[model samples]
Target chain A: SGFRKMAFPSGKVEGCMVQVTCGTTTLNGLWLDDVVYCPRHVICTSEDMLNPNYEDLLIRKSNHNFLVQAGNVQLRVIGHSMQNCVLKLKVDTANPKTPKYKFVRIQPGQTFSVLACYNGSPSGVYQCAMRPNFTIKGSFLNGSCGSVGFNIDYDCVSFCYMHHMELPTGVHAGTDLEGNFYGPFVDRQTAQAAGTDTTITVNVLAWLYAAVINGDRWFLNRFTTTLNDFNLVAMKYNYEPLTQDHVDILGPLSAQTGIAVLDMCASLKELLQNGMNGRTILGSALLEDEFTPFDVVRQCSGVTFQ
Target chain B: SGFRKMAFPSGKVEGCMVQVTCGTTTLNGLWLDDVVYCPRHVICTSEDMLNPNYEDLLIRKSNHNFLVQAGNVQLRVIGHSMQNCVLKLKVDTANPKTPKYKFVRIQPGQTFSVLACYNGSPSGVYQCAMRPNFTIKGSFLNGSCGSVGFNIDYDCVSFCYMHHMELPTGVHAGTDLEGNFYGPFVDRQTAQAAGTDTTITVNVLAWLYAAVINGDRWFLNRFTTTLNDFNLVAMKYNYEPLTQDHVDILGPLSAQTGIAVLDMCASLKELLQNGMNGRTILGSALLEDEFTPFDVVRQCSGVTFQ
Candidate 1:
């Protein structure tokens, strides 16, 4: 819902003006996946959606979005970076008789689209709360909407892994705390089951950096501590006296890499007053480059913001 | 295209009867996604299918599959297990006036379906080649198909994390060597660009177990070492003299948890004389439970395969 900030009080690092700005990336509209969950006796699926635990099911379609088709979804990153992030598309220009798709690079700003998926597609869609592969890919694979049966479009399950923020490889550190809404539900259940009195948020970066450095706990430890400090700063600046929500962080902190860097960031953001009553955060500071100094982050550095 | 078997020498593990039956899980139909790659300048997407690196873009739609709608699909896993995996569908039964999707558990074997996704859906689609989040859930979220925009189905981009094999938290170890046809493209490029000669194959488990253990390099180390040994054994059993395919494993080995465990296995599998000429491995061994030992693996254990 907001951004986050961290302050390094000058003494944290020498001459290292580490500026880590994580934002609350909520695309409102997006998708990708390629695997099933809760399989047993040989069958499986991501969710039966039929009799869910009812913990974290993000349902509620917009009237204007009652029937979402796969063909109309198209988009492309406007900028570029060679940090292992690239969209490799196996394009199949729909041929009524026979269509042949081949691998192609989705250079930034290029329009990317898809309507087919499969389980064998080598697309790399990072999981919701996992670390981000330096370079992520998208592809069609075997995936289900909520359950697995009525519709198993092996060719429809596409996985798209996008870089969210400047990862903390050595200096910059940031992560999205807003989460992918499609995060693990078991996390929610465990959170709530622990006691109905609390909920949680995730420090996605804590889990991300580990992957960034190849399971180097030393980095993740520092990343988490740093983010933890920022969480306090976020709370402090947000008028809430540094106290996290009743339940915070809905998934594992560190286990492996591929953590979602796009979840969790709390900061100041004015409502856009858009016709939809939603503010897309044109990022005022972003006018300086955009998508930076996100909502709730605070830090000092010998380096200039410039 | 097939399955594998592992023989216990009756002296490695005792009483555990550790039966690791991994299968080449390939769902010929599906679709989903939630992130972008190589994103910068603030905007992002899964791929720009237009001019992709021409690596792993699995784009090939069947004329019969051309305009696959999200609504016409419905599926559900048929068995049941309390193993964390569950489908929580935020059912938006497409209310023409206003679709209202709710959190419902998609019981095993139930017909699961969907066509809506978003950047926020608490579903767990265990990424291909990642560790299974026991209670994986499926949900819609932000993702790109190839590049960026012709369409962005926030709701159409779903994530489905399913449990593949009985992971070896300690005893057994197995992985699907048939890397997702959509496996990492950079992995592909690197494989090709590396003198354009040698190749690789992934032991997804080596990566998964690390996550299963929260990035305990020790476990991953062993995981890799064990899998590496199996690669040789697989080569031996497969009659290829244990020579790995040139340019194998098109992705990172171990960095974090949630690694896709559904890739890399080379063993015995039969070709089905079916009309499609493609066999889904109904799994004869599976009659004993199905999906085990995978296509390539060897371990001696007092543990009975029975």
Candidate 2:
């Protein structure tokens, strides 16, 4: 039927929660004094209600929690509730000018997954959040349901410079630890087994690193700090930062040697700093060239040089 | 019919060169002893051989010289010859990787213009040489026919900076006195009469001056001397070079005030040099920002500062 309320012993009964289940779907029902309520879709046969499986799903109203998993372009939500609730997922576009959303009815003790494909061009950053809607005995539990938020980065695969990782055999490289494909090595396992050329892998990584350190503002914040730190280290030892060639060689080596990602980032930061210094030095040399000409012209115009 | 020999007075004939012309076509022909030769396909008719107009086209063999004009992806050749010579124009491609050739035939005593439309994308620098081909009395003047080369710079027209210039009604914009279109107001007569927009006129002139002074090595040689003189003047008065705003405003004013081009160039050189000094001074200020961050990072990294 639709919904049913169970009457309990007339004496004061407290701290009792009811959980109903049908197939894999489960719902936790609220406890009001001696009355226990369940949604209509949940068949609470006498045996089903007393089953231990249904009891296992019962969670405290105050302990309702949500789990979120974010990927390059997908999101998953696992919601636990003390009562039936509607889950609303709202996704924000990379551009502040647009808003995005999705809705799902989440029975208690269940997991929902959404895969969003970025249909447009590359390099977009997005964010999303989920809110729960629940009620207890006809009274809305609006305050009880809080929102969980996450960031989804849909960046170009080329931006991930360490893409050419030499993984062990049999491990398919479907996704990185963060579940994003770097580039042409989408089928990492197959590619590795087939001994696919990693030129594309290197090219993509190089472009991505260049784009981020030079282009993206959010990423640039971290890059600038890293570069600054690298420069300091260089000055201390009176050594130059890494050059372009150093980064190029080290990138693939790091992947092959399975070096720590943080260490690779540090090395790259030093390389960037060195490259910037080289540019400044080069610009100064050109400045000298320009000055020489200025001096000559000044003399020709009957003016003296300092 | 291909070979002709003429006998003069019984004295030894030295330095005798023959020039042949058919209609407007003139050929610098080689003279082997008493025989005069012309290249194949140059029809020497009785009327063409006797025409006084053809005689004027015959330049002395030693005076055979070629003049070239290059602009907007086009090349023109003005060839002078003492004898009937076949004028062949050969153009080469800008790219050394691909050897391309375009050939054209030119008659003696005529100015031949080749308007090569740049079919490809923009910013292609092409180079070509005009090779003269001529023969007289079946003797080929091939070895004597030298090539004259020119650089066709098909740079961005927008690089001209200011393309618009107001001018009087009757005068058409053509080549300037320097043989280059500074901007839309090419004709000085119309420009002066129309009281043309000197702003555009001046803007174009300023960029042209800067480009030559900085970029052209030959011009830079002269510019350097002038700049040296200007620097001496500045030092004498303890004054700095003109500021950015000063250069900007003075450029147009110089053109409007009828200042000599040389004086304007001298003023701009000082302005550019002074602006550079300003940058160096500004950089010193930012150096403070850089040093503070460096010191903090040095302390964190357990590095000693000098």
**Each candidate's fnat, in order?**
0.00, 0.00
Looking at chain B only, the TM-scores across the models are 0.18, 0.15
lDDT of 1: 0.19
Across residues A154-186, which tens digit of lDDT does each residue of candidate 1 receive?
A: 122212222222211211111111222112122
Question: What DockQ results do all the predictions give, each relative to the true complex?
Answer: 0.01, 0.01
Off by over 4 Å in 1: A1-124, A128-306, B1-124, B129-306
Give the alpha carbon lDDT tens digit for every residue of B32-73 in model 2: 222232331233333543333434434322212321112223
TM-score of 2: 0.17
Q: Tens digits of per-residue lDDT for model 1 on B1-306?
A: 111121111111111111110021111112222111111111111243223432222222112221222333332222211111111112222222211112122211111111111111111111111112112122111121111111011122212222121111211111111112111122211121111111112332222222233222322222222345545544533222223332133123312233433222212111101111211121111111111122122111111111
**Candidate 2 at residue B187, lDDT?**
18
How far does residue B49 in candidate 1 sit from its true spot (Å)?
47
| Per-residue lDDT over A203-230 for candidate 2, one digit per residue giving the tens place of the 0 to 100 score | 2223233223222222223332343455
Worst 10 residues of 1 chain B by lDDT: B13-22
Q: In DockQ, how does model 2 score against the reference complex?
A: 0.01
